[PDB]
Amino acid sequence: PVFEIDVGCDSSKYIMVRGFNKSRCQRRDFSYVIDKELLDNLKV
Amino acid sequence: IKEGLAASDDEGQFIDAIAGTCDSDCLKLPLFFAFYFSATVFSNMCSIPVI
Q: Resolution of this PDB entry, in A? A: 6.8
Q: Could you give the angle at the alpha carbon of A36 between the alpha carbons of B24 and B17, nearest 5°? A: 35
**Chain B residues with beta carbon closer than 8 angstroms to that of A31:** 3-6
Distance CA A25, CA A17 (A): 15
Query: Could you tell me which of A29, A41, A34 has the C-alpha nearest to residue B2?
Result: A29
B15: nearest CA partner in chain A: A28
Query: Could you tell me which of A38, A36, A29 has the C-alpha nearest to residue B6?
Result: A29
Distance CA B24, CA B41 (A): 30
User: Method used for this model?
Assistant: cryo-EM
